């Protein structure tokens, strides 16, 4: 569709076929207090091996909604803002983002996130994030 | 240790950076 992904991808994601299980221990849970109350997130820190720069993959504990824009920025470190806006627009018209006043960025349900993970070559990392415990 | 990243995670969640 109206889509073209960035050219350079985080070397962390060269192989989409690796088993995710060894990654699950590295997730962390964190509670964030919002005006309407606390909510729990599961986060996985992904350090690009060559720029040494860390990004968080993030998941809501209650319904496993995953931040698609966090996935995008970890996958494509040298992406322009126009490239990001283009793909987030794509996610809107082709997947089913959730709407949530409290969190920034575009979040999507688990099955949508795994569809993106195939496109971004991040399937082991989203699988580990989704299978991680919140407790 | 893991507390070092609490603040930047929460700011990314709430404000995107």
JSON list of C-alpha atoms in Angstrom, two decimals:
[
{"chain": "A", "resi": 1, "resn": "UNK", "atom": "CA", "xyz": [0.00, 0.00, 0.00]},
{"chain": "A", "resi": 2, "resn": "UNK", "atom": "CA", "xyz": [1.22, 3.53, 0.83]},
{"chain": "A", "resi": 3, "resn": "UNK", "atom": "CA", "xyz": [4.29, 1.94, 2.38]},
{"chain": "A", "resi": 4, "resn": "UNK", "atom": "CA", "xyz": [8.05, 1.74, 2.08]},
{"chain": "A", "resi": 5, "resn": "UNK", "atom": "CA", "xyz": [10.11, 0.74, 5.09]},
{"chain": "A", "resi": 6, "resn": "UNK", "atom": "CA", "xyz": [13.46, 2.34, 5.97]},
{"chain": "A", "resi": 7, "resn": "UNK", "atom": "CA", "xyz": [16.51, 0.83, 4.28]},
{"chain": "A", "resi": 8, "resn": "UNK", "atom": "CA", "xyz": [18.85, 0.35, 7.25]},
{"chain": "A", "resi": 9, "resn": "UNK", "atom": "CA", "xyz": [17.65, -1.99, 9.98]},
{"chain": "A", "resi": 10, "resn": "UNK", "atom": "CA", "xyz": [19.01, -2.61, 13.47]},
{"chain": "A", "resi": 11, "resn": "UNK", "atom": "CA", "xyz": [21.55, -5.46, 13.11]},
{"chain": "A", "resi": 12, "resn": "UNK", "atom": "CA", "xyz": [19.91, -6.90, 16.24]},
{"chain": "A", "resi": 13, "resn": "UNK", "atom": "CA", "xyz": [17.09, -8.11, 13.95]},
{"chain": "A", "resi": 14, "resn": "UNK", "atom": "CA", "xyz": [19.07, -9.88, 11.22]},
{"chain": "A", "resi": 15, "resn": "UNK", "atom": "CA", "xyz": [17.43, -13.28, 11.90]},
{"chain": "A", "resi": 16, "resn": "UNK", "atom": "CA", "xyz": [13.66, -13.51, 12.45]},
{"chain": "A", "resi": 17, "resn": "UNK", "atom": "CA", "xyz": [13.68, -17.29, 13.00]},
{"chain": "A", "resi": 18, "resn": "UNK", "atom": "CA", "xyz": [15.51, -17.56, 16.34]},
{"chain": "A", "resi": 19, "resn": "UNK", "atom": "CA", "xyz": [13.73, -19.05, 19.33]},
{"chain": "A", "resi": 20, "resn": "UNK", "atom": "CA", "xyz": [12.41, -16.36, 21.65]},
{"chain": "A", "resi": 21, "resn": "UNK", "atom": "CA", "xyz": [12.51, -18.30, 24.94]},
{"chain": "A", "resi": 22, "resn": "UNK", "atom": "CA", "xyz": [16.06, -17.27, 26.01]},
{"chain": "A", "resi": 23, "resn": "UNK", "atom": "CA", "xyz": [14.94, -13.63, 25.81]},
{"chain": "A", "resi": 24, "resn": "UNK", "atom": "CA", "xyz": [11.99, -13.88, 28.24]},
{"chain": "A", "resi": 25, "resn": "UNK", "atom": "CA", "xyz": [14.16, -13.60, 31.41]},
{"chain": "A", "resi": 26, "resn": "UNK", "atom": "CA", "xyz": [15.42, -10.21, 30.18]},
{"chain": "A", "resi": 27, "resn": "UNK", "atom": "CA", "xyz": [12.03, -8.50, 30.24]},
{"chain": "A", "resi": 28, "resn": "UNK", "atom": "CA", "xyz": [11.16, -6.21, 33.13]},
{"chain": "A", "resi": 29, "resn": "UNK", "atom": "CA", "xyz": [7.80, -5.11, 34.51]},
{"chain": "A", "resi": 30, "resn": "UNK", "atom": "CA", "xyz": [7.22, -1.52, 35.56]},
{"chain": "A", "resi": 31, "resn": "UNK", "atom": "CA", "xyz": [4.21, 0.21, 37.11]},
{"chain": "A", "resi": 32, "resn": "UNK", "atom": "CA", "xyz": [3.37, 3.72, 35.87]},
{"chain": "A", "resi": 33, "resn": "UNK", "atom": "CA", "xyz": [0.92, 5.90, 37.79]},
{"chain": "A", "resi": 34, "resn": "UNK", "atom": "CA", "xyz": [-1.60, 7.75, 35.64]},
{"chain": "A", "resi": 35, "resn": "UNK", "atom": "CA", "xyz": [-4.20, 10.30, 36.80]},
{"chain": "A", "resi": 36, "resn": "UNK", "atom": "CA", "xyz": [-6.83, 7.54, 36.59]},
{"chain": "A", "resi": 37, "resn": "UNK", "atom": "CA", "xyz": [-4.58, 5.09, 38.43]},
{"chain": "A", "resi": 38, "resn": "UNK", "atom": "CA", "xyz": [-1.58, 2.80, 38.01]},
{"chain": "A", "resi": 39, "resn": "UNK", "atom": "CA", "xyz": [-0.97, 0.57, 35.02]},
{"chain": "A", "resi": 40, "resn": "UNK", "atom": "CA", "xyz": [1.67, -2.12, 34.54]},
{"chain": "A", "resi": 41, "resn": "UNK", "atom": "CA", "xyz": [3.94, -2.41, 31.50]},
{"chain": "A", "resi": 42, "resn": "UNK", "atom": "CA", "xyz": [6.37, -5.09, 30.37]},
{"chain": "A", "resi": 43, "resn": "UNK", "atom": "CA", "xyz": [9.50, -3.67, 28.77]},
{"chain": "A", "resi": 44, "resn": "UNK", "atom": "CA", "xyz": [12.41, -5.24, 26.92]},
{"chain": "A", "resi": 45, "resn": "UNK", "atom": "CA", "xyz": [15.57, -3.20, 26.38]},
{"chain": "A", "resi": 46, "resn": "UNK", "atom": "CA", "xyz": [17.07, -3.67, 22.91]},
{"chain": "A", "resi": 47, "resn": "UNK", "atom": "CA", "xyz": [20.56, -2.25, 22.43]},
{"chain": "A", "resi": 48, "resn": "UNK", "atom": "CA", "xyz": [21.56, -1.94, 18.78]},
{"chain": "A", "resi": 49, "resn": "UNK", "atom": "CA", "xyz": [24.88, -3.86, 18.74]},
{"chain": "A", "resi": 50, "resn": "UNK", "atom": "CA", "xyz": [26.68, -1.41, 16.46]},
{"chain": "A", "resi": 51, "resn": "UNK", "atom": "CA", "xyz": [25.52, 2.02, 17.67]},
{"chain": "A", "resi": 52, "resn": "UNK", "atom": "CA", "xyz": [25.41, 0.79, 21.31]},
{"chain": "A", "resi": 53, "resn": "UNK", "atom": "CA", "xyz": [22.12, 2.72, 21.63]},
{"chain": "A", "resi": 54, "resn": "UNK", "atom": "CA", "xyz": [19.17, 1.29, 23.61]},
{"chain": "A", "resi": 55, "resn": "UNK", "atom": "CA", "xyz": [15.45, 1.30, 22.83]},
{"chain": "A", "resi": 56, "resn": "UNK", "atom": "CA", "xyz": [12.54, -0.15, 24.78]},
{"chain": "A", "resi": 57, "resn": "UNK", "atom": "CA", "xyz": [9.99, -2.56, 23.41]},
{"chain": "A", "resi": 58, "resn": "UNK", "atom": "CA", "xyz": [6.91, -2.03, 25.51]},
{"chain": "A", "resi": 59, "resn": "UNK", "atom": "CA", "xyz": [3.68, -3.85, 26.21]},
{"chain": "A", "resi": 60, "resn": "UNK", "atom": "CA", "xyz": [0.64, -3.11, 28.35]},
{"chain": "A", "resi": 61, "resn": "UNK", "atom": "CA", "xyz": [0.12, -5.84, 30.92]},
{"chain": "A", "resi": 62, "resn": "UNK", "atom": "CA", "xyz": [-3.69, -5.81, 30.96]},
{"chain": "A", "resi": 63, "resn": "UNK", "atom": "CA", "xyz": [-4.45, -6.35, 27.26]},
{"chain": "A", "resi": 64, "resn": "UNK", "atom": "CA", "xyz": [-0.94, -6.84, 25.76]},
{"chain": "A", "resi": 65, "resn": "UNK", "atom": "CA", "xyz": [-1.21, -3.77, 23.53]},
{"chain": "A", "resi": 66, "resn": "UNK", "atom": "CA", "xyz": [2.23, -3.10, 22.03]},
{"chain": "A", "resi": 67, "resn": "UNK", "atom": "CA", "xyz": [3.70, 0.25, 20.94]},
{"chain": "A", "resi": 68, "resn": "UNK", "atom": "CA", "xyz": [4.19, -0.03, 17.18]},
{"chain": "A", "resi": 69, "resn": "UNK", "atom": "CA", "xyz": [6.23, 3.17, 17.08]},
{"chain": "A", "resi": 70, "resn": "UNK", "atom": "CA", "xyz": [8.65, 1.79, 19.67]},
{"chain": "A", "resi": 71, "resn": "UNK", "atom": "CA", "xyz": [9.11, -1.27, 17.45]},
{"chain": "A", "resi": 72, "resn": "UNK", "atom": "CA", "xyz": [9.67, 0.97, 14.43]},
{"chain": "A", "resi": 73, "resn": "UNK", "atom": "CA", "xyz": [12.31, 3.17, 16.08]},
{"chain": "A", "resi": 74, "resn": "UNK", "atom": "CA", "xyz": [14.25, 0.18, 17.37]},
{"chain": "A", "resi": 75, "resn": "UNK", "atom": "CA", "xyz": [14.10, -1.53, 13.97]},
{"chain": "A", "resi": 76, "resn": "UNK", "atom": "CA", "xyz": [15.06, 1.52, 11.89]},
{"chain": "A", "resi": 77, "resn": "UNK", "atom": "CA", "xyz": [17.53, 3.72, 13.80]},
{"chain": "A", "resi": 78, "resn": "UNK", "atom": "CA", "xyz": [18.23, 6.05, 10.84]},
{"chain": "A", "resi": 79, "resn": "UNK", "atom": "CA", "xyz": [14.60, 6.56, 9.79]},
{"chain": "A", "resi": 80, "resn": "UNK", "atom": "CA", "xyz": [13.35, 10.03, 8.91]},
{"chain": "A", "resi": 81, "resn": "UNK", "atom": "CA", "xyz": [10.25, 11.43, 10.58]},
{"chain": "A", "resi": 82, "resn": "UNK", "atom": "CA", "xyz": [8.45, 11.30, 7.23]},
{"chain": "A", "resi": 83, "resn": "UNK", "atom": "CA", "xyz": [9.27, 7.58, 7.02]},
{"chain": "A", "resi": 84, "resn": "UNK", "atom": "CA", "xyz": [7.85, 7.03, 10.50]},
{"chain": "A", "resi": 85, "resn": "UNK", "atom": "CA", "xyz": [4.70, 9.06, 9.87]},
{"chain": "A", "resi": 86, "resn": "UNK", "atom": "CA", "xyz": [4.24, 7.19, 6.59]},
{"chain": "A", "resi": 87, "resn": "UNK", "atom": "CA", "xyz": [4.31, 3.79, 8.31]},
{"chain": "A", "resi": 88, "resn": "UNK", "atom": "CA", "xyz": [2.22, 4.81, 11.32]},
{"chain": "A", "resi": 89, "resn": "UNK", "atom": "CA", "xyz": [-0.36, 6.10, 8.85]},
{"chain": "A", "resi": 90, "resn": "UNK", "atom": "CA", "xyz": [-0.12, 2.69, 7.18]},
{"chain": "A", "resi": 91, "resn": "UNK", "atom": "CA", "xyz": [-0.72, 0.92, 10.49]},
{"chain": "A", "resi": 92, "resn": "UNK", "atom": "CA", "xyz": [-3.86, 3.01, 10.97]},
{"chain": "A", "resi": 93, "resn": "UNK", "atom": "CA", "xyz": [-5.36, 2.11, 7.61]},
{"chain": "A", "resi": 94, "resn": "UNK", "atom": "CA", "xyz": [-4.38, -1.58, 7.59]},
{"chain": "A", "resi": 95, "resn": "UNK", "atom": "CA", "xyz": [-4.25, -2.69, 11.24]},
{"chain": "A", "resi": 96, "resn": "UNK", "atom": "CA", "xyz": [-6.32, -1.79, 14.30]},
{"chain": "A", "resi": 97, "resn": "UNK", "atom": "CA", "xyz": [-4.41, 0.52, 16.66]},
{"chain": "A", "resi": 98, "resn": "UNK", "atom": "CA", "xyz": [-5.88, 1.07, 20.09]},
{"chain": "A", "resi": 99, "resn": "UNK", "atom": "CA", "xyz": [-6.89, 4.51, 21.34]},
{"chain": "A", "resi": 100, "resn": "UNK", "atom": "CA", "xyz": [-5.55, 5.55, 24.75]},
{"chain": "A", "resi": 101, "resn": "UNK", "atom": "CA", "xyz": [-5.32, 9.12, 26.02]},
{"chain": "A", "resi": 102, "resn": "UNK", "atom": "CA", "xyz": [-2.63, 8.31, 28.58]},
{"chain": "A", "resi": 103, "resn": "UNK", "atom": "CA", "xyz": [0.16, 6.96, 26.35]},
{"chain": "A", "resi": 104, "resn": "UNK", "atom": "CA", "xyz": [2.04, 8.58, 23.48]},
{"chain": "A", "resi": 105, "resn": "UNK", "atom": "CA", "xyz": [2.59, 6.83, 20.19]},
{"chain": "A", "resi": 106, "resn": "UNK", "atom": "CA", "xyz": [0.63, 4.23, 18.27]},
{"chain": "A", "resi": 107, "resn": "UNK", "atom": "CA", "xyz": [-0.22, 0.99, 20.08]},
{"chain": "A", "resi": 108, "resn": "UNK", "atom": "CA", "xyz": [-1.66, -2.15, 18.52]},
{"chain": "A", "resi": 109, "resn": "UNK", "atom": "CA", "xyz": [-3.12, -5.47, 19.71]},
{"chain": "A", "resi": 110, "resn": "UNK", "atom": "CA", "xyz": [-0.81, -8.51, 20.00]},
{"chain": "A", "resi": 111, "resn": "UNK", "atom": "CA", "xyz": [-1.68, -10.16, 16.67]},
{"chain": "A", "resi": 112, "resn": "UNK", "atom": "CA", "xyz": [-1.11, -6.85, 14.86]},
{"chain": "A", "resi": 113, "resn": "UNK", "atom": "CA", "xyz": [2.26, -6.47, 16.59]},
{"chain": "A", "resi": 114, "resn": "UNK", "atom": "CA", "xyz": [3.33, -9.95, 15.47]},
{"chain": "A", "resi": 115, "resn": "UNK", "atom": "CA", "xyz": [2.30, -9.06, 11.93]},
{"chain": "A", "resi": 116, "resn": "UNK", "atom": "CA", "xyz": [4.55, -5.99, 12.16]},
{"chain": "A", "resi": 117, "resn": "UNK", "atom": "CA", "xyz": [7.29, -8.11, 13.75]},
{"chain": "A", "resi": 118, "resn": "UNK", "atom": "CA", "xyz": [7.43, -10.22, 10.59]},
{"chain": "A", "resi": 119, "resn": "UNK", "atom": "CA", "xyz": [7.82, -7.02, 8.54]},
{"chain": "A", "resi": 120, "resn": "UNK", "atom": "CA", "xyz": [10.48, -5.61, 10.89]},
{"chain": "A", "resi": 121, "resn": "UNK", "atom": "CA", "xyz": [12.24, -8.97, 11.43]},
{"chain": "A", "resi": 122, "resn": "UNK", "atom": "CA", "xyz": [11.52, -8.70, 15.17]},
{"chain": "A", "resi": 123, "resn": "UNK", "atom": "CA", "xyz": [9.43, -11.86, 15.74]},
{"chain": "A", "resi": 124, "resn": "UNK", "atom": "CA", "xyz": [11.68, -13.37, 18.46]},
{"chain": "A", "resi": 125, "resn": "UNK", "atom": "CA", "xyz": [11.57, -10.08, 20.37]},
{"chain": "A", "resi": 126, "resn": "UNK", "atom": "CA", "xyz": [7.81, -9.54, 20.25]},
{"chain": "A", "resi": 127, "resn": "UNK", "atom": "CA", "xyz": [7.21, -13.21, 21.11]},
{"chain": "A", "resi": 128, "resn": "UNK", "atom": "CA", "xyz": [9.44, -12.87, 24.17]},
{"chain": "A", "resi": 129, "resn": "UNK", "atom": "CA", "xyz": [7.75, -9.60, 25.13]},
{"chain": "A", "resi": 130, "resn": "UNK", "atom": "CA", "xyz": [4.27, -11.15, 24.87]},
{"chain": "A", "resi": 131, "resn": "UNK", "atom": "CA", "xyz": [5.19, -14.34, 26.73]},
{"chain": "A", "resi": 132, "resn": "UNK", "atom": "CA", "xyz": [6.96, -12.49, 29.55]},
{"chain": "A", "resi": 133, "resn": "UNK", "atom": "CA", "xyz": [5.24, -12.39, 32.92]},
{"chain": "A", "resi": 134, "resn": "UNK", "atom": "CA", "xyz": [3.87, -9.19, 34.42]},
{"chain": "A", "resi": 135, "resn": "UNK", "atom": "CA", "xyz": [4.60, -10.55, 37.90]},
{"chain": "B", "resi": 1, "resn": "UNK", "atom": "CA", "xyz": [20.45, -1.08, 38.50]},
{"chain": "B", "resi": 2, "resn": "UNK", "atom": "CA", "xyz": [17.33, -1.61, 36.41]},
{"chain": "B", "resi": 3, "resn": "UNK", "atom": "CA", "xyz": [16.07, 1.55, 38.19]},
{"chain": "B", "resi": 4, "resn": "UNK", "atom": "CA", "xyz": [18.40, 3.64, 36.00]},
{"chain": "B", "resi": 5, "resn": "UNK", "atom": "CA", "xyz": [15.98, 3.16, 33.07]},
{"chain": "B", "resi": 6, "resn": "UNK", "atom": "CA", "xyz": [12.71, 3.69, 35.00]},
{"chain": "B", "resi": 7, "resn": "UNK", "atom": "CA", "xyz": [12.55, 7.41, 34.22]},
{"chain": "B", "resi": 8, "resn": "UNK", "atom": "CA", "xyz": [13.26, 7.31, 30.48]},
{"chain": "B", "resi": 9, "resn": "UNK", "atom": "CA", "xyz": [10.88, 4.39, 29.98]},
{"chain": "B", "resi": 10, "resn": "UNK", "atom": "CA", "xyz": [8.07, 6.27, 31.73]},
{"chain": "B", "resi": 11, "resn": "UNK", "atom": "CA", "xyz": [8.75, 9.44, 29.71]},
{"chain": "B", "resi": 12, "resn": "UNK", "atom": "CA", "xyz": [8.72, 7.48, 26.45]},
{"chain": "B", "resi": 13, "resn": "UNK", "atom": "CA", "xyz": [5.41, 5.90, 27.46]},
{"chain": "B", "resi": 14, "resn": "UNK", "atom": "CA", "xyz": [3.75, 9.18, 28.37]},
{"chain": "B", "resi": 15, "resn": "UNK", "atom": "CA", "xyz": [5.36, 11.68, 25.97]},
{"chain": "B", "resi": 16, "resn": "UNK", "atom": "CA", "xyz": [7.09, 9.55, 23.31]},
{"chain": "B", "resi": 17, "resn": "UNK", "atom": "CA", "xyz": [10.61, 10.72, 24.23]}
]
